[PDB]
Design an enzyme around this catalytic site. Sequence first.
Site, PDB file in Angstrom:
ATOM      1  N   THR A   1      30.641  44.750  34.636  1.00 25.27           N
ATOM      2  CA  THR A   1      29.282  44.222  34.711  1.00 25.27           C
ATOM      3  C   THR A   1      28.555  44.872  35.890  1.00 25.27           C
ATOM      4  O   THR A   1      29.188  45.335  36.829  1.00 25.27           O
ATOM      5  CB  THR A   1      29.286  42.676  34.860  1.00 25.27           C
ATOM      6  OG1 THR A   1      29.779  42.325  36.153  1.00 25.27           O
ATOM      7  CG2 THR A   1      30.176  42.029  33.807  1.00 25.27           C
ATOM      8  N   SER A   2      27.229  44.905  35.822  1.00 24.34           N
ATOM      9  CA  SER A   2      26.375  45.463  36.886  1.00 24.34           C
ATOM     10  C   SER A   2      26.614  44.796  38.249  1.00 24.34           C
ATOM     11  O   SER A   2      26.834  43.580  38.319  1.00 24.34           O
ATOM     12  CB  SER A   2      24.903  45.299  36.477  1.00 24.34           C
ATOM     13  OG  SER A   2      24.035  45.912  37.413  1.00 24.34           O
TER      14      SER A   2
ATOM     15  N   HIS B   1      33.438  48.394  41.868  1.00 25.28           N
ATOM     16  CA  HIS B   1      34.555  47.611  41.398  1.00 25.28           C
ATOM     17  C   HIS B   1      35.838  48.286  41.856  1.00 25.28           C
ATOM     18  O   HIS B   1      35.865  49.497  42.112  1.00 25.28           O
ATOM     19  CB  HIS B   1      34.536  47.470  39.874  1.00 25.28           C
ATOM     20  CG  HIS B   1      33.425  46.605  39.369  1.00 25.28           C
ATOM     21  ND1 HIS B   1      33.369  45.251  39.611  1.00 25.28           N
ATOM     22  CD2 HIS B   1      32.318  46.906  38.651  1.00 25.28           C
ATOM     23  CE1 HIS B   1      32.282  44.750  39.051  1.00 25.28           C
ATOM     24  NE2 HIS B   1      31.626  45.733  38.460  1.00 25.28           N
ATOM     25  N   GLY B   2      36.892  47.490  41.976  1.00 23.33           N
ATOM     26  CA  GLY B   2      38.183  48.011  42.388  1.00 23.33           C
ATOM     27  C   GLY B   2      39.343  47.119  42.037  1.00 23.33           C
ATOM     28  O   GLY B   2      39.165  45.988  41.567  1.00 23.33           O
TER      29      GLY B   2
ATOM     30  N   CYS C   1      37.166  44.832  44.966  1.00 22.74           N
ATOM     31  CA  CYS C   1      38.317  43.946  44.812  1.00 22.74           C
ATOM     32  C   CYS C   1      39.611  44.723  45.034  1.00 22.74           C
ATOM     33  O   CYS C   1      39.634  45.946  44.889  1.00 22.74           O
ATOM     34  CB  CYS C   1      38.344  43.322  43.412  1.00 22.74           C
ATOM     35  SG  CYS C   1      37.046  42.098  43.124  1.00 22.74           S
TER      36      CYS C   1
HETATM   37  C1  LIG Z   1      36.287  42.636  41.578  1.00 21.67           C
HETATM   38  C2  LIG Z   1      35.339  43.629  42.162  1.00 21.67           C
HETATM   39  O1  LIG Z   1      35.689  44.799  42.266  1.00 21.67           O
HETATM   40  C3  LIG Z   1      33.985  43.141  42.598  1.00 21.67           C
HETATM   41  C4  LIG Z   1      33.656  43.812  43.919  1.00 21.67           C
HETATM   42  C5  LIG Z   1      32.173  43.925  44.141  1.00 21.67           C
HETATM   43  O2  LIG Z   1      31.466  43.897  42.986  1.00 21.67           O
HETATM   44  O3  LIG Z   1      31.628  44.068  45.228  1.00 21.67           O
HETATM   45  N1  LIG Z   1      34.092  41.706  42.767  1.00 21.67           N
HETATM   46  C6  LIG Z   1      33.478  40.829  41.909  1.00 21.67           C
HETATM   47  O4  LIG Z   1      32.887  41.273  40.933  1.00 21.67           O
HETATM   48  C7  LIG Z   1      33.571  39.337  42.276  1.00 21.67           C
HETATM   49  C8  LIG Z   1      34.676  38.730  41.496  1.00 21.67           C
HETATM   50  C9  LIG Z   1      34.521  38.182  40.286  1.00 21.67           C
HETATM   51  C10 LIG Z   1      35.661  37.559  39.552  1.00 21.67           C
HETATM   52  C11 LIG Z   1      35.648  37.990  38.094  1.00 21.67           C
HETATM   53  C12 LIG Z   1      34.264  37.909  37.474  1.00 21.67           C
HETATM   54  C13 LIG Z   1      33.303  38.813  38.226  1.00 21.67           C
HETATM   55  C14 LIG Z   1      33.207  38.143  39.574  1.00 21.67           C
HETATM   56  N2  LIG Z   1      32.113  38.469  40.461  1.00 21.67           N
HETATM   57  C15 LIG Z   1      30.783  38.243  40.240  1.00 21.67           C
HETATM   58  O5  LIG Z   1      30.265  37.810  39.219  1.00 21.67           O
HETATM   59  N3  LIG Z   1      30.169  38.626  41.412  1.00 21.67           N
HETATM   60  C16 LIG Z   1      28.738  38.581  41.612  1.00 21.67           C
HETATM   61  C17 LIG Z   1      28.238  37.147  41.659  1.00 21.67           C
HETATM   62  C18 LIG Z   1      26.766  37.119  42.038  1.00 21.67           C
HETATM   63  C19 LIG Z   1      26.102  35.827  41.601  1.00 21.67           C
HETATM   64  C20 LIG Z   1      24.994  35.446  42.544  1.00 21.67           C
HETATM   65  O6  LIG Z   1      24.593  36.081  43.508  1.00 21.67           O
HETATM   66  O7  LIG Z   1      24.459  34.249  42.198  1.00 21.67           O
HETATM   67  N4  LIG Z   1      29.051  36.379  42.585  1.00 21.67           N
HETATM   68  C21 LIG Z   1      29.896  35.381  42.149  1.00 21.67           C
HETATM   69  O8  LIG Z   1      30.277  35.248  40.994  1.00 21.67           O
HETATM   70  C22 LIG Z   1      30.359  34.426  43.218  1.00 21.67           C
HETATM   71  C23 LIG Z   1      29.480  34.409  44.421  1.00 21.67           C
HETATM   72  C24 LIG Z   1      29.859  35.100  45.548  1.00 21.67           C
HETATM   73  C25 LIG Z   1      29.046  35.099  46.661  1.00 21.67           C
HETATM   74  C26 LIG Z   1      27.859  34.403  46.654  1.00 21.67           C
HETATM   75  C27 LIG Z   1      27.480  33.701  45.528  1.00 21.67           C
HETATM   76  C28 LIG Z   1      28.294  33.709  44.415  1.00 21.67           C
HETATM   77  C29 LIG Z   1      31.079  39.055  42.355  1.00 21.67           C
HETATM   78  O9  LIG Z   1      30.880  39.466  43.486  1.00 21.67           O
HETATM   79  N5  LIG Z   1      32.294  38.921  41.747  1.00 21.67           N
END
Ligand SMILES: *CC(=O)[C@H](CC(=O)O)NC(=O)[C@@H]1C=C2CCCC[C@@H]2n2c(=O)n(C[C@H](CCC(=O)O)NC(=O)Cc3ccccc3)c(=O)n21
Lengths: 140, 140, 102, 102
Positions: free
Chosen positions: A29-30, A88-89, A130
């Site tokens: 995902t983006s 992503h990682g 990650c």
């Molecule tokens: C796993 C990775 O490589 C990435 C690293 C990166 O993108 O910097 N990590 C994620 O994507 C992290 C982990 C997950 C678990 C599996 C589903 C994808 C998920 N995810 C994700 O959706 N985000 C972005 C959202 C943003 C939503 C927002 O701003 O409202 N963040 C969250 O889901 C949780 C969150 C974290 C911090 C502040 C608010 C919400 C991720 O960063 N990840």
Amino acid sequence: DNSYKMDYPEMGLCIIINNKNFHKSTGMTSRSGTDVDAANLRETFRNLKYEVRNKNDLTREEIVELMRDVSKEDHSKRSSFVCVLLSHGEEGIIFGTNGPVDLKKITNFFRGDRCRSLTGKPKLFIIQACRGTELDCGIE
Amino acid sequence: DNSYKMDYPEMGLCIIINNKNFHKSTGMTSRSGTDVDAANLRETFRNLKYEVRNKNDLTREEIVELMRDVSKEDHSKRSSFVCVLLSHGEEGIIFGTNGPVDLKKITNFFRGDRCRSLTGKPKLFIIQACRGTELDCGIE
Amino acid sequence: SGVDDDMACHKIPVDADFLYAYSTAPGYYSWRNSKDGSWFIQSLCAMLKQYADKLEFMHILTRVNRKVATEFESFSFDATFHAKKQIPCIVSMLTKELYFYH
Amino acid sequence: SGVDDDMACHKIPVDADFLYAYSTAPGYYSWRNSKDGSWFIQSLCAMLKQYADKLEFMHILTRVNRKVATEFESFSFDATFHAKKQIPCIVSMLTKELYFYH
Ligand SMILES: *CC(=O)[C@H](CC(=O)O)NC(=O)[C@@H]1C=C2CCCC[C@@H]2n2c(=O)n(C[C@H](CCC(=O)O)NC(=O)Cc3ccccc3)c(=O)n21
Ligand SMILES: *CC(=O)[C@H](CC(=O)O)NC(=O)[C@@H]1C=C2CCCC[C@@H]2n2c(=O)n(C[C@H](CCC(=O)O)NC(=O)Cc3ccccc3)c(=O)n21
């Protein structure tokens, strides 16, 4: 000498690979908010006197060729080297837009015996990605 | 608070697992010189005011039970925790006398949610062991 | 000593003088806010701004560790990904102290 | 910020406040003299003796890195294991500075 010599003519390069958008075939995902990170980093490392080079949405192959070419530059007048990876990682792996690359492939170009103009100089790899799928629920 | 509070009544435990001799079935050769390391460590950490506990030639099972029991002590009056592992190893793995143990199994006992009397306190794992079979020929 | 030191010709290891500043612990997810950026990069930049003229790099990075660990927590309507925490991970094979103001 | 900070109830990560002082880089052999002990433990103890009353722990460990990297080299009649080098690896998920003299 307890401290690295940091008074060469240039502090060095700060290479920022900013991967926001990923090919449909990966199902990744983006990465919304990564541009805010890339801009913060550019400004922060500019104020530290780094030569900042930003790159967006690079394939695994473009990442590898970029770091190869950068390692083959003459870094003789530079104090240090910085690379920032935003993607992503998973453990030991950073994603190009079209799939995974082994971090070791990236970092090996800069080994003491392979980038002689950076031998003895600090090589900094800053990684926002990650490193697996474990979840920290915290305590307290 | 930029510094850990280090004026609790006790600095804490320094657990040294010194594995010199390994069962015939593993094909691991004797680790000559490890006793010199164990003695140096005992004296060095004694002068830092640690409660040093040395253990020799522990099976994988004895390592696991020792660290479990130690994590279940009341560390409330201690500033820190130190564990020193001296053995054969590979990435993520330390050898008992009779075979491999996953380092994660050892360290998980001391997690912030599992050893509450060490929550907020520095937990130091000092590891003399191989982490694979790569060879550094160096440069210069 | 003896056979393994006071080398006539000096060499250094090929992995010497690398530092890896990882956003998260080994095996773990790392978190990103869609509007403000990642926790780690936000905190890294803020600590560099505040301390790059005052502290050695590992000490700057130790404050990044504390900022991420203590100030940030995930929020999600999916309970699986809600109230999660993160500790960045400094991997140093450096051989000297690094001061940017040098 | 907003949803992910200024938490009413404070938590810390379960992997916070760990430090791993590895003798060698990831994937690599680590070396030991049969009479004097391992390079890493020899150097660690000597740097603690000299600097534990003077330096923060990461800075002490950075001198261990330099001592091992620069002063030591393997010796063997087997060419495969001769003239080999080692860089120790500091993995810090600490959140504060550590001074033993505190
Ligand atoms: C796993 C990775 O490589 C990435 C690293 C990166 O993108 O910097 N990590 C994620 O994507 C992290 C982990 C997950 C678990 C599996 C589903 C994808 C998920 N995810 C994700 O959706 N985000 C972005 C959202 C943003 C939503 C927002 O701003 O409202 N963040 C969250 O889901 C949780 C969150 C974290 C911090 C502040 C608010 C919400 C991720 O960063 N990840
Ligand atoms: C791989 C491991 O887990 C151990 C870690 C440890 O025992 O502390 N590492 C070794 O055993 C290291 C690596 C190898 C490669 C494979 C064969 C076993 C070998 N080896 C070894 O034989 N020693 C001990 C000897 C001592 C001989 C002496 O003191 O004359 N050291 C060497 O072979 C090379 C050497 C290193 C330093 C100084 C002199 C010689 C090891 O430590 N290893």
